[PDB]
Amino acid sequence: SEISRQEFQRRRQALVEQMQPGSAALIFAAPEVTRSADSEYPYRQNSDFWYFTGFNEPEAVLVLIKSDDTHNHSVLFNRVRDLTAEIWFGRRLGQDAAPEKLGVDRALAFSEINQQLYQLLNGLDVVYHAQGEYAYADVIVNSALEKLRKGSRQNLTAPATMIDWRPVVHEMRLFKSPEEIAVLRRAGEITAMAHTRAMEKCRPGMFEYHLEGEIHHEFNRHGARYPSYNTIVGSGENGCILHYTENECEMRDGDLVLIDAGCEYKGYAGDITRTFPVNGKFTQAQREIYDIVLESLETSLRLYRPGTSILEVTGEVVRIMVSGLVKLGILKGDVDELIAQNAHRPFFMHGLSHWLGLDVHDVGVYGQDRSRILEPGMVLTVEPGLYIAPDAEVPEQYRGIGIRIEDDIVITETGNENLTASVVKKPEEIEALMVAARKQ
Amino acid sequence: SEISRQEFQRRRQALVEQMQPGSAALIFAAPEVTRSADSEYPYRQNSDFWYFTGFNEPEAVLVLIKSDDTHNHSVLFNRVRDLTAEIWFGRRLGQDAAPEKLGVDRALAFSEINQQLYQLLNGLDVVYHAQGEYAYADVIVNSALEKLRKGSRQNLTAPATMIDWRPVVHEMRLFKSPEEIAVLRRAGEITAMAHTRAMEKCRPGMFEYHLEGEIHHEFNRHGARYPSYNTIVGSGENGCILHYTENECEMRDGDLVLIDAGCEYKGYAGDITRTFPVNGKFTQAQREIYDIVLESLETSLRLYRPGTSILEVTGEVVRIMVSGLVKLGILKGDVDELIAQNAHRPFFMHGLSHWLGLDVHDVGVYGQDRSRILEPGMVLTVEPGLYIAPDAEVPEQYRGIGIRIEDDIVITETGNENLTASVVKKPEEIEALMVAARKQ
Amino acid sequence: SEISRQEFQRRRQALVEQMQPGSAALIFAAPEVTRSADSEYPYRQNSDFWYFTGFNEPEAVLVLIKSDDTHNHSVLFNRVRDLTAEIWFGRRLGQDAAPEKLGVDRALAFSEINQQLYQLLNGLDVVYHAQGEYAYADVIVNSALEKLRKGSRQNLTAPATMIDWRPVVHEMRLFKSPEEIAVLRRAGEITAMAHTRAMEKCRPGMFEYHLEGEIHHEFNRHGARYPSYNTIVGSGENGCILHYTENECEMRDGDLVLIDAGCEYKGYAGDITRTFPVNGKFTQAQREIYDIVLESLETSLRLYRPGTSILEVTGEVVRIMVSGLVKLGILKGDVDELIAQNAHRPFFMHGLSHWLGLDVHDVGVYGQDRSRILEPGMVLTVEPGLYIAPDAEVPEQYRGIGIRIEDDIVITETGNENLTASVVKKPEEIEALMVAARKQ
Amino acid sequence: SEISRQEFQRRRQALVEQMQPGSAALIFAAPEVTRSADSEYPYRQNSDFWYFTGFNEPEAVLVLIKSDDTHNHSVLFNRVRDLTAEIWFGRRLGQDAAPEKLGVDRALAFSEINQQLYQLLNGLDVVYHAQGEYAYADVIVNSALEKLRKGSRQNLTAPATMIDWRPVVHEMRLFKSPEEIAVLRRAGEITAMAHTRAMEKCRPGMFEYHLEGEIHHEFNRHGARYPSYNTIVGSGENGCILHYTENECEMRDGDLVLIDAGCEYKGYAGDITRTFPVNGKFTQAQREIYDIVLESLETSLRLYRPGTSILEVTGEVVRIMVSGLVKLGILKGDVDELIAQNAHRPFFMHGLSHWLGLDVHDVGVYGQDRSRILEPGMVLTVEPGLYIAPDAEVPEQYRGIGIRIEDDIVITETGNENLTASVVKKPEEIEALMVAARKQ
Ligand SMILES: [Mg+2]
Ligand SMILES: [Mg+2]
Ligand SMILES: [Mg+2]
Ligand SMILES: [Mg+2]
Ligand SMILES: [Mg+2]
Ligand SMILES: [Mg+2]
Ligand SMILES: [Mg+2]
Ligand SMILES: [Mg+2]
Ligand SMILES: [Mg+2]
Ligand SMILES: [Mg+2]
Ligand SMILES: [Mg+2]
Ligand SMILES: [Mg+2]
C-alpha cells in the first residue's frame, strides 16, 4: 500500500480550507543530522512536511498561499540540481520536475529563499508558521518579516498576525484516511511478522541484540528499512525498564523477554510489544502476572469504540490489575480503596494508549487525563503492563518480572479493528509456536 | 577484542603529557539527537570523548587538570542517578561508581557544572577546549570564563590562553595501538563476513535494500549493532553514484552491484566495498573495467608501506587506470599526456585512501594532496574505482558501470596488513562463491 | 505641562478596547546600554512602554490581559526593592507602591518573570508581542510559549495566535491628545528659545560645538535634560551634510551655519532647524538660496491642513524650488520638464516632513510616498532645504551652501498650529536679532 | 594637549613586542548604539581600539600581524567611502587615505572582512582576540577560524591557540605616558573649572539638574563635549545615594549638595567630587562630617607615592574615619576594636581609589583587596566619603548627610601630582568662593 498524489493534494486543500484569506502557511523540511564527524544518520523527513508532500529531501519549504476563498497556489523551495553533488550524494528532484512530481504550482531554488520569501509574504495579513520547530526555519522567517517591517519606503508590509499551524495540522493527522489505514494495516502485518520471528528464533544463550537483528531483518525484507523507534529487547530484570535499548545481555533460560519493536512503512509506525519465555515455557509465577496483563489487553480491545475514551478504559484496566495483584498477595487490602489510592502505580506507571501514525507517539490532542471522546479514524495503541522491581517488597517469585503486551488499533464505526493480531499473545499459542519452531 | 581500562588511562596520560602545566583540558559528550518528534536516533558518543573514556552517556564532560609536570587529576561531570528516569530510559552510572568504573579521580553531577567548572579553571593559565564542536559546550565554557574574568573582586582569574586540543588528540588517534588494531582486525572480519553473505544471497529480482538487510543482520550477529556509515547498495547505474543510499531498485540480471558497507565494532569502523554481478557471472565488458580497478587495488596493496604516501601510490593507480582506459578506447591519446591532463578524473573522481578508525573518515593530518609520509600504526582504506556515466561519450558497453573495490589496511614495520582480505575480490573467486551458494 | 495618571490609564484602555477577548499584550522596557566598559549612557525608556506607563526603569514588562469585552486587568513586572542596589544606583519603585503609583492591578518581581509569565498566558487564544524589538524580550516570550506547548500533561495550552501590537499602538501615537499637544507646545518653546540663544551668541571664531553647548544649556534650564537627537551645527560646507554631528570646526566670518536641534521634554521631541550668517549679515548669494527655502516653508505652513498630504504639499515645494533655481541659473531649461525629471534632487534630497512625537522621527503609517490624508491631531515637521555641493557645476557663489529651515506643527480642524514660530526665520528679523545681541 | 601619531605607533609596537611570532592581534571597534527607534546615542569608540588608533568610526578592525621578531605589519578594516551615506551621516576616512592618516600598512573595506580575515590568519600559530567583548566580533572571528579548520583540502590551517590580549593591553594602559598625563592634566583643569562654576552658580531654589547644565556647558566650552560618566548632583538625602543621577529635586537652603562630575577630553576622563552648602555656609553638623572626609583626603594625598598601595592608605583613612565618628558619638566603643569590626562600613561602603584613564573606572589589575604596589605613571582617584542614612540610629543632626571629596592624581617618582587641586575643598575657601560669587 501507498499514499497517492491525490491524497497529498487533498491534505493541502484541507489545510488551505481552514486558513484565513490573505495568508501563507510555511512548512519546513527536517535538517540533516550528524551521527559522528562527517557521517550523518539516515535522513528522516519532518512528519508534517512529509504529510503534505511525500518529499524526502532536506532544504525544502512548502509555501501555501491563500488569496481568498476560491484562489490559492503553492510554491516549493528545494535544492537545485547539481551534477557534482549528485554524482556524490545522490539524485535530486530540482525545480523543473517538481511541479509535476509533487503537484505544486511553482518551484524555486532553496538557495534563493531569503531573496524570494519576503516577496511571497508581502501584503498578506497572516502567516502560519510553527515557531520554535527548527532554528534554521525561525531565522529564515524572522529575516523575511523584518525586511517587510522595515521596507515601508519600498511599499512593503508584513503580516501582523502569526499563527501556529501545528494544532490544525495535528488535528488533521489524528484522523486517518482509508489510504492511511491501509498503510498502517501493512505496517502492523510487517511488525507482527517480525515479532513472530523473534519468538521462533529465541533460544537460551542468544543475546538480546540477536532478536533485534532478526526483527530488523524482517522489517527490511518487506520494504520497511528503518524501525519507527529504537527496538527494546529486555530479558529478565531488563523488562522492568520501559525503554531499555542497550539490548546487551545474554538471554537466560527461566527469564521472560519483553520485545517492543515497530517498523516504519511509508512513513507510518507499527508498534508492538510481546513478552514471552526465553525457553518457550511460562512458569506458574510468570503466567500469574501475564494473565492479568493479557486480560487487561483483551478487555480493552473489547471496550474500545466510538464514545468511550482512553481515560475510561484505563479505569477498567486499573480494576483488573488491582484485583489480580490482590489475589496474588502483591497488594493487600480492599480493592476499591486500593484503586482510590492508585495502588497499582508502582507496577503500572505509564498510560494505556497513545495515538499512532507518522510518529509512533503521534500528534493530536488527548484532553485532560486522556479523556477525549474517541471517534472513527483515530489510531492508537493498547499496551497494559506490569513491572515488578527486583527489590519490590512482594513475594519473591514476582520480583524482576516485566511484562507488556501491545496491539495497534483503529477506531471504527462500531468498535475497533486490531491491526496487529496476526502475532499471537495467548500463552498457550505462544508456547505452541515456540515448540513448533524448535522441532523444525 | 576490546579496549581495556588501562588503555583509556594511558591515552589520558599521553594527552596530559603534552599539556602545559597550570592547565585543564575539557572534553564534551555528544548531545542526544532527535529523529522525529520525541523519538531519538540510537545514541552515538563523540569519538574523542569516547577515545578517553569508553563512556556511552550524554551530558558528560571529562576535565583533565595538569598542575605541573608530575601532578594531575581528572574530574568527570555526568548525569546523576534518578530512579524515575532510569525506570523509563535505562540505567545510569552516577557519581558514586564512576571513579572506579572509568578510572577518574572525582565525579560530579552534570547539573552542577555551571556552579563547579569555573572553580576548576580559576587561576589556571591555559584551557584546552574544542571551540565550535558543540554549541552547548561553548555556552558552558564561555559562561565559566566570563565569571572568572568579571570576578576580580572575588579574587578569581581566567586562563588567558585557550588551545584547541583536536590537532593533538587527532594526531594521537592517527596511530593505533595493538589493542586498537585487534579491534579493527575484528571489525574487518565481521564486515568481510557481511560482504561474503551479500554475494551469496544476491539473486536477480531482489531489491538493493535486501542486501542491506543481510549485511546489517550479519553485523548484528557478531555484536556490531550499528553500521559505521549508511550502507550503499548501487546496482546498475546507481553504482555511478558514490554515496548512493536510497537502495530502492530491483536488482536486474545483467547489471553489477556495488556494495559499500562497514560495521561499527566497539566504536571502530570497518569499511569494505565489493562490486559483483547480480547474476554471478561477469560479462566481458564488466571484466574489462573490473580488472583495471582490481590491478589498481592489488598494486596499491603491494606498494603501501612506511616511507611512501597516499599521493605517491595514487600516482601509480592513475597510470594503471589511464593505460587500461586507453586500451579499451575509453580514452584516446598518449598515456603520459593523458596523465598530465588528469584525463582519468571523469571516471575516478575521489581519493584512493582515507584514514580509518573511530570514524570511518578518520581524523589526522593528511599533508598537502595527502603527501604525508606513512608510518607504522596508521590505518587506511584502499579504494580505487571507475565510474562510467550512463551518458559518457565512450563505447556503449561501458556506459553506466560503477565499480569500486575497497580493503582496509594497517601500515606495519615492513609493509601493511590487510584486515579485509577474508572476503574475495578476484573475479573467478567471486563467481565460484556465488555458484557454490546457488547449488546449496 | 505633563501627562496625567488618567491619560496613561486611557491609553491602556484604548489598546485593550482593540484587543481580542482571551488575549494578553506584552510591552517591554528598554535595556540599559553600555557607553564604555562599566559606564552606561543615560537611560532612555522604550517609547511604547513609556507611552502606556510613564515608568522610567529597565527590567519591567507591562502585561495587559483581556478576558472579555468588559473584563480586563493589568500586571506589571518590575525590579524588586533592594537596599544595597539603591544605596548605589538609585531608588526603585518596587512591587508594593506600583499599583497605586502607575495604576496597575498587580505587580510582581521581574526576577520571577520566567516562573510567572507562562501562567498568565496559559489558556489564552492570542498574545500581542512586538517580535524582534528586543532579543531579551523574545527569549522571555518564546520560553513562556514553549513551556505551554510542551505542558499538555500539566493541562497547559499556548495561545496559537501571536499579533504585532506595533501597527495598532503606533496608529494611536500618530494622533496626539490635548495633553500631548500641550507638552509638545512646550517642547517647541524650549527648543525655540535654544535656537534664539544660539543666534544671539554666535560670533566668528567660535567653534560649532560652542553653539551646541549653548543649546543644551538652554534645554536643561527649562527642565529638558537631554536632546531628542544628536545636535547638528554645520557651518560652511558642513551644512551640506544632513546629519553633520562632528561640530568640530571653527565658524568663519562669511559662512552660514545650519543648526538642527531639539529638546526632549517629558519624553516628547522638539525638532527645529535654523540657518543663519555666522557674522549676522546674509550675503546676496546666501539670501538668494535662503529665500527659496523660506518661501517653501512659508507656503507649506499656509497649505498644511486636514485633507491634503505631505506628498501633495511636497509637490508645491518642488515647483517653488525648481523655479527659484532656474532664475539663479543653478538649473537650466523648462520648469515643468525639470520638475518631471526631478531636477531638484541633487539639491533637495530628503522628505519635506516626518511625524513628530515621543520619537523625533515618529511612528505611524505614511502611505505610499507619504500620500496619507492628513487629519487633526497629527504632528509633523516642515523642513525644506537646499544643499549645493562644494563641487556642484553651478555658479561659484552658490557652491558649499547648505540651508534648511524647520518648524514643528500640529494639524488642527481648519489648518495647522505652528509650535516653533517663536524663533525667527525671516532674514531681516534674524539680522535684527543678531545686531541687537551684539550691542548688549 | 593631544595624542600624537607617533604615540599611537609606539603603543602598537609595544603590543607587537609582547606577541608571539606567527600571530595576529584583532582589535574591534565599538558598535553604534540605539537610543530610541532610529536615533542613536553619540558614538563612543571602544577604549582599547581607540588606544591603538585614535580612529572614531564604527565597523573597523585593527589587525596586527607578527611574522617574527623583526617583521610585522598592520591591516585596517574600515568603512568604504560612499557619496550617499556621507551626504547623510557624515564624512568617512575610507581605504585610500587610511594608511597615511592612521599609520597602518594596508586598509581594506569592512564589507570584505569575511572574505579577507581568514586569509590573514591562515598558517599562523596564535590569534589574540578579546573573546566575549562584542558578539559581532566573535561571529566574525569564529567564522574565520571555522573556514580554516574545515579548509584542509584547500591547504588552510587555523591557529590552534587563542589568547586574550586584554590583560596585556590593560597592563599597558595602567601606566600613562607623558603625553597621556598632559591630556589628563587638562581634563582635570577643565573638570575643576566646571566644579568651581557649579559652586559659584548654586542658589537655593535651583534644581539639581541646573548645576548639571552649568557643568556640561563648562566641559563643552573647553572642547570636552561629553562627560566621562553620568553627572551626579545629590542634594540633601540624595547625597547618600552614591550614583544618584536623577538630579530632579529643588535644592534647599540648609542642605548640602554633592557633585560628582567629569569631562571626557581627547578620550580621557576627569573625575571630581565636591560637596558644599547650597546656601554657601556650612553648619556645625555639616562641618563635623566634612572635616573627617577632608582630613581623609588630605592625608591620602600626603601618603600616596611609589611603594605603598590603595589597601594600605585605605587603612589610614579607616582609622581617621572611625576616630572622627567616635568623637561625634556616631560610633561607640574602642577605636581599635571598631576598626577590627569594620564599624565604618555603614557610613563608608566603597573603595578609596580606582584607576583613571580612557575609562573613568580604568582597566588594570588591582591585586587582592587593591594591594598592588603603586609605581610612577599610575593614575587614580582619591575619594573618601561619609554617608549617614536618613534613618541611621545616630544623633539627629547627622542623619541624611552625604559627603564625598574626590581628587585625581598621578603617581610620580617621589610622591604624587594632584591634577584637580585648582578647585577648592577646604571649607573656608568654599565659603569665600560662594560669597564672592554672590556679590558679583
Ligand atoms: Mg510500544
Ligand atoms: Mg506504544
Ligand atoms: Mg525470579
Ligand atoms: Mg567505503
Ligand atoms: Mg572508504
Ligand atoms: Mg550496459
Ligand atoms: Mg530636524
Ligand atoms: Mg526633522
Ligand atoms: Mg562660497
Ligand atoms: Mg567620581
Ligand atoms: Mg571616582
Ligand atoms: Mg538634617
Care to describe what's here?
- It is classed as hydrolase.
- With 440 residues, the first copy, chain A, is of the alpha+beta class.
- Chain A folds into two domains: 1-173, 3-Layer(aba) Sandwich (Creatine Amidinohydrolase, Chain A, domain 1); 174-440, Creatinase/methionine aminopeptidase superfamily (Creatine Amidinohydrolase, Alpha-Beta Complex), CATH 3.90.230.10.
- The first copy, chain A, contains 13 helices and 19 strands.
- Chain A has helices spanning 5-18, 47-53, 83-89, 98-102, 113-121, 135-150, 166-174, 178-201, 208-221, 284-303, 310-327, 335-340, 427-438; strands at residues 23-28, 34-36, 39-40, 61-66, 72-78, 106-109, 126-129, 161-163, 226-227, 232-235, 256-261, 263-265, 268-269, 272-277, 379-382, 385-388, 401-404, 407-411, 416-418.
- A six-stranded mixed beta sheet of chain A has the order 6-5-4-1-7-8, with helices on both faces. In chain A, strands 9-12-13 form a three-stranded antiparallel beta sheet.
- In chain A, helix 5 crosses helix 6, helix 8 crosses helix 9 (208-221) and helix 10 runs antiparallel to helix 11 (310-327).
- Chains in contact: A-B, A-C, B-D, C-D.
- Residues 271, 354, 381, 383, 406 of chain A line the site of one magnesium ion (MG).
Number of self-contained structural domains of chain A? 2
Strand order of the largest sheet of chain A: 6-5-4-1-7-8
CATH class of the largest domain in chain A: Alpha Beta
Largest interface: A-B, 50 and 50 residues
Biggest sheet of chain A: strands, sense, closure?
Answer: 6 strands, mixed
PDB class: hydrolase
Keywords: hydrolase, hydrolase-substrate complex, proline-specific peptidase, product complex, metalloenzyme, pita-bread fold, dinuclear hydrolase, aminopeptidase, manganese, metal-binding, metalloprotease
Entry title: Mg substituted E. coli Aminopeptidase P in complex with product
Chains A, B, C, D: XAA-PRO aminopeptidase
